[PDB]
A paper describes a structure:
Methylation of cytosine 32 in the anticodon loop of tRNAs to 3-methylcytosine (m3C) is crucial for cellular translation fidelity. Here, we report the cryo-electron microscopy structure of the human m3C tRNA methyltransferase METTL6 in complex with seryl-tRNA synthetase (SerRS) and their common substrate tRNASer. We show that SerRS acts as the tRNASer substrate selection factor for METTL6. We demonstrate that SerRS augments the methylation activity of METTL6 and that direct contacts between METTL6 and SerRS are necessary for efficient tRNASer methylation.
Therefore, for the purpose of structure determination, we stabilized the assembly by fusing METTL6 to the flexible C terminus of SerRS and coexpressed both proteins as a single polypeptide in insect cells. Processing of the cryo-EM micrographs and particle images of the METTL6–SerRS–tRNASer complex revealed three-dimensional (3D) classes for 1:2:1, 1:2:2 and 2:2:2 stoichiometries with essentially identical intermolecular contacts in the METTL6–SerRS–tRNA interface. In brief, at the core of the 1:2:2 METTL6–SerRS–tRNA complex, two molecules of tRNASer bind symmetrically across the SerRS dimer without contact with each other. Each tRNASer interacts with both SerRS protomers. METTL6 is located at the extremity of the complex, binding its proximal tRNASer anticodon stem and the variable arm that protrudes from the SerRS–tRNASer complex. The tRNASer long variable arm is coordinated in the interface between METTL6 and the SerRS N-terminal stalk. In the same interface, two protein loops of SerRS interact directly with METTL6. Comparing the METTL6-bound tRNASer to the METTL6-unbound tRNASer copy in our structure, and also to free tRNA, we observe extensive remodeling of the anticodon arm and its global bending toward METTL6. Strikingly, in the complex structure, this C32-A38 base pair is disrupted and the bases are flipped to the outside of the anticodon loop.
Author numbering:
A (entry chain A): 27 to 72, 79 to 271
B (entry chain B): 2 to 74, 88 to 255, 264 to 477
C (entry chain D): 2 to 69, 88 to 255, 264 to 475
The structure:
Amino acid sequence: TLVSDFKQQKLEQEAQKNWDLFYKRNSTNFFKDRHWTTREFEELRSQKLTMLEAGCGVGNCLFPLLEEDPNIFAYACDFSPRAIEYVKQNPLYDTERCKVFQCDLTKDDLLDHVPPESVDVVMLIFVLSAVHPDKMHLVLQNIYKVLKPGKSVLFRDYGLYDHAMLRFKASSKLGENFYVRQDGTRSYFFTDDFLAQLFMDTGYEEVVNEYVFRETVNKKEGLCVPRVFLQSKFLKPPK
Amino acid sequence: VLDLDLFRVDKGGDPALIRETQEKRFKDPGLVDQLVKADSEWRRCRFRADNLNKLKNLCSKTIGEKMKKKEPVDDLTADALANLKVSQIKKVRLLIDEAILKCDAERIKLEAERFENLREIGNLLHPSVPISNDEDVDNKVERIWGDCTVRKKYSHVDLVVMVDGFEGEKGAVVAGSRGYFLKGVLVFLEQALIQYALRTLGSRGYIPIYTPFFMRKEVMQEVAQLSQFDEELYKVIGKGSDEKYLIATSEQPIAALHRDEWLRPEDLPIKYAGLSTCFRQEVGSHGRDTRGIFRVHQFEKIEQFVYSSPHDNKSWEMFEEMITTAEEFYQSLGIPYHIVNIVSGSLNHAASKKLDLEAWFPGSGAFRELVSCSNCTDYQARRLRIRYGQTKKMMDKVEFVHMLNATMCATTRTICAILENYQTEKGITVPEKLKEFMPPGLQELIPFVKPAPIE
Amino acid sequence: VLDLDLFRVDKGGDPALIRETQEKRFKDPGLVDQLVKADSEWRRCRFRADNLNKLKNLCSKTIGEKMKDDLTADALANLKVSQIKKVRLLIDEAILKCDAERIKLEAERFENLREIGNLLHPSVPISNDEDVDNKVERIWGDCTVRKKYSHVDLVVMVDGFEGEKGAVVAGSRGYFLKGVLVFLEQALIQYALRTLGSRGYIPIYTPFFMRKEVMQEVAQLSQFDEELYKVIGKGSDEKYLIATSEQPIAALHRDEWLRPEDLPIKYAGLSTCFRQEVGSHGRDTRGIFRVHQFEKIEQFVYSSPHDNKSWEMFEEMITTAEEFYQSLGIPYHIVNIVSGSLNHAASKKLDLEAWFPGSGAFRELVSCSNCTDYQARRLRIRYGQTKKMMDKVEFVHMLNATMCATTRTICAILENYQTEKGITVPEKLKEFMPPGLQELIPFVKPAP
RNA sequence: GCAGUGGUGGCCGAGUGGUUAAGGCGUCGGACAUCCGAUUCGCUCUGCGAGCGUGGGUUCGAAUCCCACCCACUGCGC
RNA sequence: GCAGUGGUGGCCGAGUGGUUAAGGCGUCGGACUUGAAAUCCGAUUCGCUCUGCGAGCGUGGGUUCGAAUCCCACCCACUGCGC
Ligand SMILES: Nc1ncnc2c1ncn2[C@@H]1O[C@H](CSCC[C@H](N)C(=O)O)[C@@H](O)[C@H]1O
Ligand SMILES: [Mg+2]
Ligand SMILES: [Mg+2]
Ligand SMILES: [Mg+2]
Ligand SMILES: [Mg+2]
Ligand SMILES: [Mg+2]
Ligand SMILES: [Mg+2]
């Protein structure tokens, strides 16, 4: 049935290694820059807005919004050293606007690099699906302490019944809505209820949490397919 | 052989399960423990040999660089060697050579020992196998077809002579114990059986294939067992010397047909109807009704052979399909039989399960095995390196195909069954499905032309 | 082996004919003189041994009667028993020496005799170069037409041949035959067996290996080293794989007295043959043309040695083969093989060589041979059932002829029936082919 | 594969340490459906020699007693 | 069976004593792109204590610090012979 229970333990203990070898084999050429960020969230629109990018990758999510709006300071978090080195070697990088640092969002703590209750917006774009479902609230609590008590957290990631979930063969299933790719990285497909009751258990307040529907079409192969991402915004209670 | 990672417990393995299986087969446990210790030692020896090879490589690279930059004249590191004259690095290379040689001897010994322990551990058992060691008592009868209690006058040992189709004494003069000439009406009947079986299997989608009868030793080792390869196979010798062995079944060359290949999953259920002459050296007589042409040294056999996908329980559905094909063959021939599930202690090492079709011999009053259908899973494909996909994945290990085989028709034994079941007082009635393939005049009856040797 | 009375002027023989035949076969005429000297010495040795044995038996009879070397029975009875034992010791020494000499002479004579060939039939072309002097006797069909592919490409185009994997499994020349070509080979066997069975032949499936003590009597020394595989059992037996089913069929009646009434005894041998020599002579000899293992259907006849009946049967056998190949539509010519390229047993040989239009050559498909009593007297297969007093026995005549070697006949069929879309099935094999293969064997691969 | 008994002539059958391998039954020929003769190999042929599964041994002497192998049959293994 | 030339990865095909076994072709998965893809990014022999190191160029050996490259044997092909 599911993947061997021994193998799932090897996947959990080698999560950082699997992401590091991904950046080794694929360099910065796999993912593409996300220019839809500023438009999608009512924040990030056009003073000194300090931001934390949890799971920054090689950029692709902060460099666009950072060359767009020129009064944003950014913290960058990633547990893979290769991704950090790629972010630093980017020609668009300057220390006066970015502060990149490695931090395993489940084991390490964010206060060792960012000041408490300082960040006004933190982004979770396709980062939480790579974390084991039983260590996600760890990440939510780790980022709960650096958020300004009126600030918020922005989240887009895979949702239930997306096509990518359906392409996976049965030999790639770790559990309910929990799969693994050929390269070792994993994918959890969230539901609105699961994410809601995962954010509520760590002290957040739901604002918007609803699915976003798209489609993928390759004209040459004439392939058009449905896609289901879950977008949301949670807010830290004022008082 | 089994997958070595089934014994590594640091991987996802479990040698306790191999111990349980080795007990259920009534073989020697503790072979598993010898294997585990030999393998755990071989892994450390391999680590050490790789490290010695790395040091030798690094010495050679440094020497080459010193030479091409025109130089004036084992905790080693890259920078450490970069500070030595060429003569000193060669002095180090000599120590590396000695260590490498002794480690290589130790590693070859450990490899041979681990392998001779591994080749004597049997395949995992299907949970349907009856756990036992008494074949006569616990062999489970699954199905019965026809009337398996009727009695008739003559046994095949008399019937082959009353039709004048058998020459035993002259055969033993020509070939020796058990040699025989088949002649007259029984050559036509054997050919009719071959035509009928090939046509049936071809209509089912099997590819008829006529195999070579000499297999080389290098290839026969990978498809045979120790005991068989030792005392059951004839050895052929030409001019020179001679490593060739007469095949004991067509399943052996057909298994080596896709040897060392990456088979596309599409077209994976390849079905082969092998046709060859088989040469078996063991012929023991347990009474009179096992003589004649029943147990002989040479005979033609038609075999089913299927390479299958290892996923989705497909090889077990294929197993049922193959036994059903043989069943329908013998039902169209009108021969009564029962199906028996063989006990754990009687399976060979490769089989996870084995079914046998045992035909009722009314003139002998016995059940005799005609068909033998086995599912050997990936035990042999792993040895022959017959991979299931064309592409190897990034991290996953290679998967192997399952290989099933099943006798369709051994001609001598089936002739004996037909003779015993179709005898009348005037001759042998020809089965309705074989009348197409018989000559005119031999399409209704094979007449008795000699008296019974017992009478 | 020839009758030893042919070399004895005392009997109604003479070795001059044997010398002239050894010359016609372009063999050594000097073997005959060595044989004659060995035989003339052996007769003396045998006479002396018989006289010594006679004296020994008389000594024993005298001792036995009394208990209950010019020595007459009377001159021996007037002695004590100890004296007779001394005489017996003398006789034993003499007998030992004489038996040593006689065994040496017998071995020498049989060595020189197994290398002298059968007498020749006056029709045999006397020459040594086969390619110019082989007398073509009759033509059938169109032996000049030419077509596109040779069999080496056709067996692959129909997907019925696996040479590379066969050479991995079995080695040089090993092969798998698959698919449509297995059905075609089986159809050929069925058609040949029914053709021969309608003519009065008895089908016979033979053992594939033979004890060495029996194989010596049907084969030559050249064959064992050069062409016979050796089978090894357990405990290290001495069996050989047969090179042709004529060898076991010949030994089927060894040491028998056949009734003259049943003598045209005709057998249709069916077996697998194993040859070691597969040497190649270009591309058109590759494929399944010269292989180590192939099925063959044979004609074997035991005949009366009287009234020219053996030669009438010889003509009948070659006519049976010719009709088989005319009904298949294979063009051929019949060739009278020259005396230089005859085996020792044959007194005349006719080959049927078929035209290969894709290869542009004649290839031998049938070989018909009349060995007269060469092998019958070595196997002791005797003509009459009763022996006359003071009259030597006569042995039967033995003839063998290939009916169909299946691989070569498949090659000839493929080359002669190829079209642009596949191979047309010969009209006579359609009833023995599976449905779907009764009009055309389709091409499914490109030509290499 | 081992552990029990076996192996006679064209066939079957006697055969005991001293045969003409008896008797039959075939078959061939001759005499007229009976009778007679012949009916393994060799030789310098009207007699001698050899051959009793095949080889050897013991004995003056072996078809006969001993052994090995081969092939059967009866039980085991498989 | 001789007396010549040859044998590279799933396939083709480079390879020059210091490869990363090039380039293709085939196959297989991953895709998060709002500037989505009539495509992009990769993987693709074996082994080990796996971000690396080791082995592997028909198979075995030799020479060399170092060989897929040079030598030998065997095996299997092709070209000429014997048969
Ligand atoms: N538990 C964890 N702690 C910190 N980073 C993690 C993490 N789990 C996964 N990641 C990082 O999250 C990244 C997801 S790839 C997505 C990158 C980014 N969201 C973008 O839009 O480009 C990976 O690079 C991985 O390194
Ligand atoms: Mg007898
Ligand atoms: Mg008598
Ligand atoms: Mg004897
Ligand atoms: Mg290649
Ligand atoms: Mg490449
Ligand atoms: Mg090599």
